[PDB]
Amino acid sequence: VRRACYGVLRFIMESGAKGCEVVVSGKLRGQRAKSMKFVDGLMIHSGDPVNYYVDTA
Amino acid sequence: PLQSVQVFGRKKTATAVAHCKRGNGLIKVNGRPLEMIEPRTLQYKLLEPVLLLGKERFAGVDIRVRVKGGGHVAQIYAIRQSISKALVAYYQKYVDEASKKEIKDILIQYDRTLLVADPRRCESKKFGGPGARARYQKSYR
Amino acid sequence: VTVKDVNQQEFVRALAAFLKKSGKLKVPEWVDTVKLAKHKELAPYDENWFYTRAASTARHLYLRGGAGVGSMTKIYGGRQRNGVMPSHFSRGSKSVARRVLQALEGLKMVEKDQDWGRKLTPQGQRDLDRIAGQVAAAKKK
Amino acid sequence: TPDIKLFGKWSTDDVQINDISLQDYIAVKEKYAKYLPHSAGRYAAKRFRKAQCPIVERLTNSMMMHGRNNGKKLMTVRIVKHAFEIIHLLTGENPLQVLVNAIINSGPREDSTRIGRAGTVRRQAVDVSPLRRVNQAIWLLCTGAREAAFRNIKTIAECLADELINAAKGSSNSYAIKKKDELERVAKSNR
Amino acid sequence: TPCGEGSKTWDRFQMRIHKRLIDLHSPSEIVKQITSISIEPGVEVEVTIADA
Amino acid sequence: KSYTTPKKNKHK
Amino acid sequence: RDKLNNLVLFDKATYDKLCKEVPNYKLITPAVVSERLKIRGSLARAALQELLSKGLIKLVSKHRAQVIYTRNTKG
Amino acid sequence: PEKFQHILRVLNTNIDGRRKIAFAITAIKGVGRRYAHVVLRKADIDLTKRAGELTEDEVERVITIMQNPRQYKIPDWFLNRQKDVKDGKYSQVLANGLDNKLREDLERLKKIRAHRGLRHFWGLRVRGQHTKTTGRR
Amino acid sequence: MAVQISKKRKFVADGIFKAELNEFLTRELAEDGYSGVEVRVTPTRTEIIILATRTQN
Amino acid sequence: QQLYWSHPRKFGQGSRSCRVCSNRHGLIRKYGLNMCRQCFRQYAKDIGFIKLD
Amino acid sequence: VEQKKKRTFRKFTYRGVDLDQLLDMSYEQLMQLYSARQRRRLSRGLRRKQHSLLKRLRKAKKEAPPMEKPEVVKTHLRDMIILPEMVGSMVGVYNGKTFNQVEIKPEMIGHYLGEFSITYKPVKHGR
RNA sequence: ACGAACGAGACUCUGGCAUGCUAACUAGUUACGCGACCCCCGAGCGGUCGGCGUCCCCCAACUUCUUAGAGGGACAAGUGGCGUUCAGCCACCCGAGAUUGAGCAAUAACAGGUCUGUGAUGCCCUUAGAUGUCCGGGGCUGCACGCGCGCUACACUGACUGGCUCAGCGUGUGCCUACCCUACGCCGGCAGGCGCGGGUAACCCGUUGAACCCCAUUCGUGAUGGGGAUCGGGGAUUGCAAUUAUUCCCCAUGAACGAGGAAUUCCCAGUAAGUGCGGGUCAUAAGCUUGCGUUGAUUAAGUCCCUGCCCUUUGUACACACCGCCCG
Ligand SMILES: [Zn+2]
């Protein structure tokens, strides 16, 4: 997942970006919960322009 | 035209539109008699300006008002704003400045509260509270 | 004068006087056992009820012609206290006002409005507007 | 600013000060006068404009406390002018000046706060600000007018007019006029 | 609240809709001819003698 | 549903 | 309950005192009668209307809360 | 007026001289304000007056008017007892005929074991009457 | 729809179909990349433009 | 069959199904959707309803 | 209730007609005698659920000698106006869980079976 | 330290200064042609003044008002005071003077809740005597107590009947398959029976001819006509079916209650409260939700003293952090 999310980041920065945040959840071993998160750039959170200025998925 | 004035006025939401008209001098609110909105306690209310703006300036006016909305005294300030709103342009635009001078001053000589009413209104209920600001009580065990 | 310039209440009271003494207006079918818009849980007490109620339906027809049960019982009604319940509105006596309209439509002081209803006759207008000037020139409250 | 100041039953000027220490808080000529008072509480801007808010408007707006009774406001003002008329009839002279002097004579003087010297809750007396004084007088005479027409026969206006009679024109004849001595003697011994 | 709640919550869902109406006295065809500039944005265009 | 231990004869 | 015993119906001696004593002040009200002398309120209404019949007083107020009847040196 | 009468003797039942004619005739078994006004209108007896000075002439009139409504037909839906469980007829009942009839109906239910006739064995309100912590006086 | 209803429920039906087809196409045709769709309604027409990284799907 | 079907379904609140999850714990027919609000907050960006209060 | 002056003269004259003329009566007067709720149940029919019963009711009354009682007919249901001919029977209703036998009394007729047979089965209590 | 963001300001809605802008025969108007109908209505019983939700057929007309697009307010802007005139703050003239409230939506995570919104979902489980399935009756609503969320009040500013004084919220005809918003007269009292009709909605209800403020009226401080249940006797009304009253209506039953001691919430402004009305559930439908809306109040412009965020100094055996270790 990490070496694939690095690729996601690499491809979006190839096509030119200003900030992104990719978060994955789930246990990568056993019984105790884990999640991981990647962030860079500018990523506005509040206000209205999130939905139409980052194309969340 | 150039001979009468038909413009609006209102309290928070109760809206009247008053038309001062050249003629013999008559007053009519709602297309009904002046006092006879009949709060039957505020019989005193809507003749304070009528007897303090100039009985002479209540000699040529044929007031007809078209009204709707809200509550009773709210509509009373609707008409009380509307009639002044019409007569002020009745005096300034069509007519000279000396005729204006008396009633423009009598505006605040009663009160400035009439040219524009409250910038206030009741607003949306906010949930978790039974009104606009209160809150539903916080219980325990 | 116009029937607006008389007091609204005394207009209908003396309308009931005129029609009562003329005896034509429907005399009661049962005086105190009428529930009268069962939001009025109690009863009407004096046999001068139908005179006033029919007179007032006539006056509301003057206010606007061609009315009906749904649109007159709405204003005739009011508030009720509902024991162990809150207050809703469900207008009551329908045939009382219907019999009002019948007892005057056979009397040709209220006439058929277009496509439905009970509209106004020149005869009803003239009679009520004479009684208006009568009452207005007499004393008032 | 009118050519004559009248109620349709008696005059509206001829209001003065009795105990100067309350000047500019009892208000009768702020900027106008009316046929009969009515307001939203528009003077709610600060403490000062409600300090110098008119007295007749003050009492007429204040007399609606016990909940749903501001939900009957026209008839309540009918009551207030009724009570002023009852004073005018029983005791004669103009009820507004008499209520002015009655508020004066039934104003408190001092209030004692809770500052424990070594831990035990004591009291300490500070001079009542004249505005709080006049408001205690009016807004405890209103409390008395409710306690009367609640547990008596007399109606609201009759109770209020009796209180405005016997406040300035009688001693120990008001719930307010006993609150007054209670507060002042508390202030004395609790200095 | 999907299902995880501790208190009362009430969201809202609001929309923007409209009905905007021209009213012209021409035959059924010259209106077709004069009108070709409304099918550039997305707004449902319905031309009828009487109401649609 | 079929809370019961008998559903006597579903057999044809 | 512990009641004022305001006399409940029309009363001979009180009827005389009402008829020739009451319309004399500048304040009159059925409750005023029922707490100055002893009477029920509608009873005071009836004796007050009996004195109004002669017309020994000038009115000031007219309300459901109360009405005020004031002295004209008549009574 | 000057008191014609005092404490009265009605239907073999004593009443309130405290309230007026109608609103003290409501102090009778089977009567209300509504029944009081209706019966007095049917009997043509005064309202503006009071029962404490109302004459036993116009008390016995009223008694004989309420006792047998069918002679005057105050409408039967206005007449409490109706379409009952045995030998149905139409009339109104008052002083202790109500106790007699409510009694008899109650023994019918008590003997027959209806749900209400058993919740009077359980001492509660027939319906719907939550009673877990709620509504027990 | 076939019952000639008001503009309220008509616009609502339009949105109901946008919804009822979005996840259909996403969970049907995602044997490729997936970007989105865009619908619009014109006189005697209704055109839907599908947008994805394989024109051939 | 003499035992199988005798019930046309025209009653109550769960008569007509939520289209997406069809879970019957309370449904609604304001605009004929008959679909949960836990469903509608997920698909109203495609229905047309988007919060702007 | 009711003492018919026993040893003679059955008399359950509800609403003002007699039982010895009401056992052999007609649905019109029966409906105008039954209360508004019974009438309201009857103004949509006593459908097959009770026809399939009444046939067995008559079968039982004929087969079992009147010097005995007719057989116990069991209803899965709880709501039924006691008709004129089912005076004097013994019938076991289903309360939803258990068969409870109910004795037709001549002073039941004109109500619903689910009031004579209830289902909040008498609770045991505690503190 | 510099050059950087996200969270705040920004991103929107709502209410408010708009007497100037933009036009709707599917909206209103209509000021104009009291013209056609109307009364003489009135002093007068005439000229005319007053009132018609009365119409004009429409190929007259405009958006004062009217639903509102853009144009455009407001930024301590000026100045009277303070600072260091730094970023700003109180006030007044221009008045809308900042900021009307509603929204929008972080990083670490709790192991708080979501598998009984799901075919979101891994294990194992039920797998023909089912936890899959259609159905019938009962149960989710049984009462000796405790608690909270709660509607109605404890009556005189009670309030009873009758008049007339006064809207916007929104849904509104078959659906993803069964029942859409209204009005007229004929009957019984209301409930309730009857059929003709407006409408896919500025067309139509509805100029929502909305209540509590209003007033006439009353007996009379009297568990009192109140606060008004309980239960009795019926009437209709949907439904395959209301029986432990699901709802509606009456006669009538007439009760527990006198502003409540144990703890605590809420709001300092069209805001509390009083509060009729809408909308979600439906074959039945609100004391709930959450909005519309009115009549609109007591004092308050300070302070962390009580419960509480953030800051700095700063001790710590605490590293799941004071509900922690901990000692005889
Ligand atoms: Zn769903």
Q: Taking the domains of chain B in order of start, what are their residue ranges?
A: 1-141
Contact C130, C74 (CB under 8 A): no
Contact K75, K53 (CB under 8 A): yes
User: B92-96: long-range contacts at Cβ-Cβ below 8 A with a sequence spacing of 24 or more?
Assistant: B94/B2, B94/B3, B94/B5
* Closest partner CB to G10 (pick from H1, H17, H18): H1
Provide the CA D19 distance to its chain's centre, in angstroms: 15
d(Cα C70, Cα C91) in Å, to the nearest integer?
8
Closest CA to D137 of D97, D184, D175, D85: D175
On whether J14 is known to bind a ligand per the annotation, the reply is no
Contact H4, H54 (CB under 8 A): yes
The residue that minimises its CA distance to C1' of L184 is C116
CATH class of B1-141: alpha beta
Across the strands, what pairs with A39? A21
* SS3 assignment, position D183: helix
Counting DSSP H helices and E strands in chain C, the numbers are: 5, 2
Measured from the CB, is H34 under 7 Å from any atom of strand L? yes
d(Cα K38, Cα K110) in Å, to the nearest integer?
8
Contact H6, H59 (CB under 8 A): no
Domains in chain G, please, with CATH?
1-75 (1.10.10.10)
Contact H82, H90 (CB under 8 A): yes
Whether residues I18 and J32 touch (CB distance < 8 A) is answered with no
Domains in chain J, please, with CATH?
1-53 (4.10.830.10)
How do K90-94 and K74-75 pair as beta strands?
parallel
Measured from the CB, is H92 under 7 Å from any atom of strand L? yes
Chain L bases closer than 7 angstroms to a protein Cβ:
5-20, 24-27, 30-31, 38-44, 49-54, 59, 64-66, 95-97, 100-118, 120, 128-153, 155-168, 171-179, 182-192, 200-203, 205-256, 258-259, 264-287, 289-301
Nearest nucleotide to H38, CA against C1' atoms? L251
Per-residue b/e over K84-94, b at no fewer than 16 CB within 10 Å? bebbebebebe
Contact A21, A37 (CB under 8 A): yes
For C30, the domain range is: 1-141
Place of tokens 């005086």: C31
∠ CA B89-B94-B98 to the nearest 5 degrees? 85
Residue H126, phi then psi, degrees to nearest 5: -60, -40
Q: What kind and span of H or E run contains I23?
A: helix I7-28
Question: What token pair was written down for G74?
Answer: 């008549």
Whole-angstrom CA distances from H62 to H44, H48, H54, H74 are 9, 16, 11, 13
Q: Considering only CB atoms, which chain C residues are within 8 Å of H65?
A: none
**Mutation to test the H interface, candidates K15, K95, K124, most H Cβ within 10 Å:** K15
Contact residues for A16 (Cβ-Cβ < 8 A; gap 6+): none
Whole-angstrom CA distances from H23 to C123, D77, H37, H38, J53 are 44, 33, 9, 12, 57
Contact B76, D67 (CB under 8 A): no
Q: Assign residue B87 a region: left if phi > 0, alpha if psi is -120 to 50, beta otherwise?
A: alpha
Contact B115, B85 (CB under 8 A): yes
**Structure letter (DSSP) for residue C85:** B
d(Cα H81, Cα H105) in Å, to the nearest integer?
11
Is H47's Cβ below 8 Å from some Cβ in G? Answer: no
d(Cα D135, Cα D146) in Å, to the nearest integer?
16
CA of D79 to C1' of L260 (A): 30
Residue E15, phi then psi, degrees to nearest 5: -140, 165
d(Cα B59, Cα C4) in Å, to the nearest integer?
22
d(Cα B114, Cα B103) in Å, to the nearest integer?
13
Residue G13, phi then psi, degrees to nearest 5: -65, -40
Whole-angstrom CA distances from C126 to C53, C120, H103 are 20, 10, 64
Q: Return the axis-axis angle of helices D55-62 and D74-90, rounded to nearest 10°.
A: 120
- Fold assignment, I7-57: GMP Synthetase; Chain A, domain 3 (3.30.300)
**Structure letter (DSSP) for residue D6:** B
Place of tokens 């009394």: K105
d(Cα D162, Cα D173) in Å, to the nearest integer?
9
Which class for C128: exposed (0-12), middle (13-18), buried (19 or more C-beta within 10 A)?
buried
d(Cα G58, Cα G74) in Å, to the nearest integer?
9
Residue type, position D56, single letter: V
Provide the CA D93 distance to its chain's centre, in angstroms: 18
Residue spans of the domains in chain I: they are: 7-57
Contact residues for F9 (Cβ-Cβ < 8 A; gap 6+): none
d(Cα D93, Cα B66) in Å, to the nearest integer?
45
Nearest nucleotide to G40, CA against C1' atoms? L220
Q: How far off is chain D from G53, nearest CA to CA, in Å? A: 22
d(Cα D140, Cα D179) in Å, to the nearest integer?
8
The count of residues in chain A is: 57
Whole-angstrom CA distances from K34 to G70, K23, K42, K84 are 67, 14, 9, 11
Which class for B9: exposed (0-12), middle (13-18), buried (19 or more C-beta within 10 A)?
buried
d(Cα J38, Cα D152) in Å, to the nearest integer?
59
How do I36-40 and G69-71 pair as beta strands?
unpaired
Across the strands, what pairs with B32? B29
Question: What token pair was written down for I46?
Answer: 């209704």
* Closest partner CB to I42 (pick from E17, E19, E45): E45
Counting DSSP H helices and E strands in chain D, the numbers are: 7, 2
Contact D133, D19 (CB under 8 A): no
Closest CA to D37 of D46, D45, D27: D27
Which of residues 16 to 55 on G have a Cβ less than 7 angstroms from any strand L atom?
Answer: 30-31, 34, 40-43, 45
Q: Return the axis-axis angle of helices C95-105 and C69-76, rounded to nearest 10°.
A: 120
Contact residues for B48 (Cβ-Cβ < 8 A; gap 6+): B110, D34, D35
**Mutation to test the G interface, candidates D69, D155, D160, most G Cβ within 10 Å:** D155
Contact B140, B95 (CB under 8 A): no
Nearest nucleotide to J25, CA against C1' atoms? L117
Contact residues for B57 (Cβ-Cβ < 8 A; gap 6+): B87, B102, B103
**Structure letter (DSSP) for residue B37:** G
Place of tokens 């706060």: D113
| DSSP assignment of G15-70 | HHHHHHHSTTSS---HHHHHHHS---HHHHHHHHHHHHHHT-EEE----SS---EE
d(Cα D27, Cα D52) in Å, to the nearest integer?
6
The number of domains in chain C is: 1
Whether residues J51 and E12 touch (CB distance < 8 A) is answered with yes
